[PDB]
Amino acid sequence: TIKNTVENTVESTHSISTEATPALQAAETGATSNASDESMIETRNVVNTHGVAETSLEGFYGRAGLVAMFTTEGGIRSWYINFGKYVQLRAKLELLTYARFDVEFTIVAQVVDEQAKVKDFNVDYQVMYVPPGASAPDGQDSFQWQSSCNPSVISNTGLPPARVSVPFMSSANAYSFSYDGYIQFGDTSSSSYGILPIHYLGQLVVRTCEDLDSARLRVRIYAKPKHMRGWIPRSPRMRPYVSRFTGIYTDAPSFCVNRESITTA
Amino acid sequence: TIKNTVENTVESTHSISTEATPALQAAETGATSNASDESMIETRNVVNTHGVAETSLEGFYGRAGLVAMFTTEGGIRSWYINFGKYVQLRAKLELLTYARFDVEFTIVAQVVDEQAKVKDFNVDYQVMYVPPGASAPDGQDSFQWQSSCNPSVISNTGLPPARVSVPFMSSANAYSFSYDGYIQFGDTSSSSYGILPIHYLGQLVVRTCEDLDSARLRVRIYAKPKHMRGWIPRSPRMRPYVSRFTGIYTDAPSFCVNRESITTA
Amino acid sequence: ESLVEINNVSGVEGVARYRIPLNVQDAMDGQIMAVRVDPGADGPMQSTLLGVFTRYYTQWSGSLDFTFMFCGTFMTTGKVIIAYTPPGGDQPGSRQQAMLGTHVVWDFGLQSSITLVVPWISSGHFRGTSLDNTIYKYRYYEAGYITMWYQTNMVVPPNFPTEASILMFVAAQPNFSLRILKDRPD
Amino acid sequence: DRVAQLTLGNSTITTQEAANIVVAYGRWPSGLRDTDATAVDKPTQPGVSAERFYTLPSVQWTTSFTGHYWKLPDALSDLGLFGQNLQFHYLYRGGWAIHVQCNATKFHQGTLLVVAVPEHKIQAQSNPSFGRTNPGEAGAACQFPFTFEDGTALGNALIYPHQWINLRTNNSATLVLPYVNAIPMDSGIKHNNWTLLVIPIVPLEYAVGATTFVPITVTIAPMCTEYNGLRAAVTQ
Amino acid sequence: DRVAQLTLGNSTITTQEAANIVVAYGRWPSGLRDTDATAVDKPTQPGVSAERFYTLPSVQWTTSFTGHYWKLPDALSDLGLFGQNLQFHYLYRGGWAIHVQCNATKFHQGTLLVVAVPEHKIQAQSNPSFGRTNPGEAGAACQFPFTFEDGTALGNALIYPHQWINLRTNNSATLVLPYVNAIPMDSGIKHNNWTLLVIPIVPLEYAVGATTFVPITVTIAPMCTEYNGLRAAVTQ
Amino acid sequence: INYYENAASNSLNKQDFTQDPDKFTRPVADIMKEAAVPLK
Amino acid sequence: INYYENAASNSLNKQDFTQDPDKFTRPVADIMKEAAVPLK
Numbered sequence A, B: 001t002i003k004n005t006v007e008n009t010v011e012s013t014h015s016i017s018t019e020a021t022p023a024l025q026a027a028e029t030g031a032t033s034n035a036s037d038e039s040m041i042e043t044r045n046v047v048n049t050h051g052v053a054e055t056s057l058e059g060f061y062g063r064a065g066l067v068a069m070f071t072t073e074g075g076i077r078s079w080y081i082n083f084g085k086y087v088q089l090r091a092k093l094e095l096l097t098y099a100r101f102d103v104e105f106t107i108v109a110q111v112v113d114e115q116a117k118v119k120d121f122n123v124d125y126q127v128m129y130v131p132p133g134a135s136a137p138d139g140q141d142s143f144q145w146q147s148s149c150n151p152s153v154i155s156n157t158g159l160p161p162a163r164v165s166v167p168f169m170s171s172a173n174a175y176s177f178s179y180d181g182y183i184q185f186g187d188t189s190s191s192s193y194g195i196l197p198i199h200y201l202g203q204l205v206v207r208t209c210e211d212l213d214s215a216r217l218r219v220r221i222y223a224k225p226k227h228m229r230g231w232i233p234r235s236p237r238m239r240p241y242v243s244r245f246t247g248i249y250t251d252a253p254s255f256c257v258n259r260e261s262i263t264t265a
Numbered sequence C: 001e002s003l004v005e006i007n008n009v010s011g012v013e014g015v016a017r018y019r020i021p022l023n024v025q026d027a028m029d030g031q032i033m034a035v036r037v038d039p040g041a042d043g044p045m046q047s048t049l050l051g052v053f054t055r056y057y058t059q060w061s062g063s064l065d066f067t068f069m070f071c072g073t074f075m076t077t078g079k080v081i082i083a084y085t086p087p088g089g090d091q092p093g094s095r096q097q098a099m100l101g102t103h104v105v106w107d108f109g110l111q112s113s114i115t116l117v118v119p120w121i122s123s124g125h126f127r128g129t130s131l132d133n134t135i136y137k138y139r140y141y142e143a144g145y146i147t148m149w150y151q152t153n154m155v156v157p158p159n160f161p162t163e164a165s166i167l168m169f170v171a172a173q174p175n176f177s178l179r180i181l182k183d184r185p186d
Numbered sequence D, E: 001d002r003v004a005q006l007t008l009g010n011s012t013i014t015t016q017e018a019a020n021i022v023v024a025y026g027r028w029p030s031g032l033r034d035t036d037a038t039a040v041d042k043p044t045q046p047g048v049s050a051e052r053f054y055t056l057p058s059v060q061w062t063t064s065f066t067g068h069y070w071k072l073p074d075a076l077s078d079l080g081l082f083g084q085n086l087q088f089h090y091l092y093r094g095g096w097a098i099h100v101q102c103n104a105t106k107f108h109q110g111t112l113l114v115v116a117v118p119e120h121k122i123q124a125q126s127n128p129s130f131g132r133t134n135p136g137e138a139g140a141a142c143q144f145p146f147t148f149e150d151g152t153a154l155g156n157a158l159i160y161p162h163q164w165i166n167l168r169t170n171n172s173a174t175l176v177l178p179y180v181n182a183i184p185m186d187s188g189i190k191h192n193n194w195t196l197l198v199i200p201i202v203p204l205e206y207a208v209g210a211t212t213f214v215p216i217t218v219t220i221a222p223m224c225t226e227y228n229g230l231r232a233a234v235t236q
Numbered sequence F, G: 001i002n003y004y005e006n007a008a009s010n011s012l013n014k015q016d017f018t019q020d021p022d023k024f025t026r027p028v029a030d031i032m033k034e035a036a037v038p039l040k
């Protein structure tokens, strides 16, 4: 059953009885306590109108965050599409085991000198999406940039940022943020463990349409999930990340700060 | 009862009587006089259609005014969100004890040389809102600028000005422009007096996305209240402000200009 | 419900930080533990489920559920008193001072566990999640303390273990809610 | 049943080895009627601030323990807003809920009588001291338990409301008392209506090497209270 | 009319040279509604023990008199059962009835403004002391009456609820104030909601040889009070 | 017509009336009519 | 009104309710009422 506000409070009087015992509990059973406030103290009436909308999945997930940041070398660079390099959005998506969503991508680009000092100079750029089994371009002027089948976006550093939507593209019925298994049959190698090849959907490749003199493009990508669905909440991550493609971590003897004694608040 | 125009005037004739005395009053009672014009002189009919709309709260408060003005140092600066630095909008809000309103913020930015002479140069800027208990960035390239949970706006010095709305965000049922009390229990220190921590909602932090050579950003912020509600009108401020966070003042022996004698207009 | 890291002191490491000690006394009315009830504050609560989600947001409202479980032998007995103290000063210094606020008396028997409910007693509709005093003076929002004392004593048979452990669970109640998302500082 | 939960104001008590609950003379606490009232001013009824459990300091069941007592309302006269309301007013009226606790293992044997007595005087000596007659929240020792401190047989105390704590059977005792007097209201500082007495009738013994230190603990609530005749604060 | 009688709890006040009664912002004191409430525990409402007149110590209208003030509820924080209820509880809410008295012959001339101000801060100095901000039941002197201690003109104080005592016309002033704040309840020990100020605007003068020593006296009642969050007693 | 989701997005109010000022100008317990004397 | 062909083009959902949490908080085969003792 569904609700748009939190629970109200009713009046409650004193109780002296053997028949009703709401304070006694048994944690062994695996259930969380069911003692209400009104059972434990004398309460007054409160009509409570606080809403629940900021903690919905759309509420928590529906805003853009950084996924990639790079510069061109010899008028080109490419990026493997994967949300592991920047930890803030990574740490939020690993609160669910399985999720389905669409994504809205935003691209921001600018010209820099060789000293990484920004330049007031407007240039045309191209982004191409290359799915697995397609040939990627080798350099700034390769003939794969015709883009007659592969999708492209073309734009200029003096217009506002580029933006496109993408639908739910997995071969599975949901993406997976945990996978306890191996990549393929007959390869139990330790580097083949805990990767699902089904989340890998390919590369983005970037170029300047013409050769800059001395300068380079710098590029940033932001991603925003839309229409979230989610199953099986996980325990939140509590140690630093180490690697882009694995959950590897180092141990330590505490999680919170220490104090002088257990009896001093 | 509610009105859309000021009061009309009726005809009035001479009166010679003991029974009716509208000119006599007693100021001691705490009430303002109730003598009408028609009671005090012979009047004619006037149908008066003057409206009352320019003196409504929406009328008086509903227009933008300056709240902040600063430059970046080493590609960054931050601002504590508080309307005390510029006295004109400060002096208007302290005409009410309690108010609820939404705010529309407008941001205007430009590039200057080291001699504070303006420069014809277009650059990308970012503004981030950091609520209390969140970590603020240390410098131009810190990893808190990923902005995956904290809201941001990104824009360019050659587009028109940035603008966003904000709703009524206090933990209280209204903001407070006077507070006769202390910040916390067991701290009656004189610097803890007359501040409400409940109006403090955090910082804005600003950077250039890339390093400028020699130049700096200069930035101005304007705020406009919308949908005002107000309770308990106060006496207007009549001495200069001295400090951003307190009502401190210096005394003086008059408020208006002097004249040669009480009998000379 | 999730476990609270309550024994956070210098020489205590790993799973031992989840246990509260009890032992057989030779004097009366002694103190077992203290902690501040504030869910977004740095300290024992910060690693809990309720603590991590509260650190994603700036404001909170609602009642809390604290639940305790005894892990001695079948033959071990005792009674303890658990109290919530609303704001206004320091933590209470004795069992008389503590029992003037909201409290429960717990008897160890067949049902292993007990709940104390910390009800929402506040001036405004919401409180801030940080309590950080250097910039915003947000120590204004401090929510009170919870403390535990001996009511009688822990009593055992001959040659038994004279020391036993409690475990402490925390959860939100159905009137609880959060506002204004922000980036988790961990 | 053997489980119980008592809830009053902001306070709650639980037990798992109860033995029913006694309600003295078959009456619960109640208000003063308009036919029986005499003072004409409007009474004060504080509600949940006064009517809640208070816990007194504990007593050790030693080898030499003869027994202990408390006077009501003397014992609570300086605690919380029950105390302050009683000092500020000339007249008081009300009832009580009482809960006595004492726990010990299956390797211990012993028995306590827990008894509430109306209008109990101390009289083994020509002239009782103020210390012996009004001992406060700490209570005082029984020096003469066999004659019940008053010149009657201990054996006949069961005409008053009582329970036993027998360590093989139970660990707590519970009594509910209404207001008793020859007048509708009275001074709280000059007259004690009830005394609560705890007397060992079978001494404490145990298997060799078992825990020796065993406390007894008393917890009390005012119930259905009213006050009249407000003035400055006054104490004996 | 010019006669009046005010009765609250066990207390009564009379006057024969009144000038009506003011009721601030057209509202009487009232209870907190179920839609506006937030704290979930059952409140305490003491009734006639708290809601009654208290009289503060008097002030002399000297030659050098610039004016005097009081903070509410600071002034009554240590008096009677209003005081004790406010120390024992975390939150408080309520309104006030106020009556100021000053009498002098038909051979005297002078005038006082009597004004109640919401959320009034003291700020002629960089750092107000605790003595100046919470002066207790004795009150404190105005050092800066022309700027109303706060950086506003004295002349514009009449936007707040007020009366005058003008010695040719009346000898008493009466104000009734409801609860005002941005929240439903608040701490009684950390925040003062109202200030009562008494300022001479025409100085005291008289026929040669008339009585020179003329006191001013302030009498105050709490009204429609409730408290939440009971604990031990706590003060600043 | 409103284009955005939250009411903070909407334009300024257009209900610019005034009301009877007696809560500030004549807040007294007993009525004193214009034609009469105030103190009697 | 939707301007584009595919649903991935549409704006964010506005159905921001909550539901009864018993699938995570009390997932037990036999019911245990508030007023009763759990183990009997």
Ligand SMILES: CCCCCCCCCCCCC/C=C\[C@H](O)[C@H](N)CO
Binding pocket: A081, A082, A083, A084, A103, A105, A127, A128, A129, A151, A152, A153, A164, A166, A169, A175, A176, A177, A199, A201, A204
């Ligand atoms: C021209 C615009 C470029 C658009 C390219 C779209 C490619 C499709 C991307 C879908 C998003 C996939 C997200 C799935 C899983 C995450 O990467 C996980 N962190 C994998 O561990």
Ligand SMILES: CCCCCCCCCCCCC/C=C\[C@H](O)[C@H](N)CO
Binding pocket: B081, B082, B083, B084, B103, B105, B127, B128, B129, B151, B152, B153, B164, B166, B169, B175, B176, B177, B199, B201, B204
């Ligand atoms: C990315 C855009 C930035 C928007 C940040 C919004 C923060 C919320 C600001 C709300 C306005 C608060 C006004 C309240 C009180 C005044 O500051 C008073 N002068 C305090 O004394």
Ligand SMILES: [K+]
Binding pocket: A005, A006, A007, A008, A047, A048, A049
């Ligand atoms: K509701």
Ligand SMILES: [K+]
Binding pocket: B005, B006, B007, B008, B047, B048, B049
């Ligand atoms: K008109």
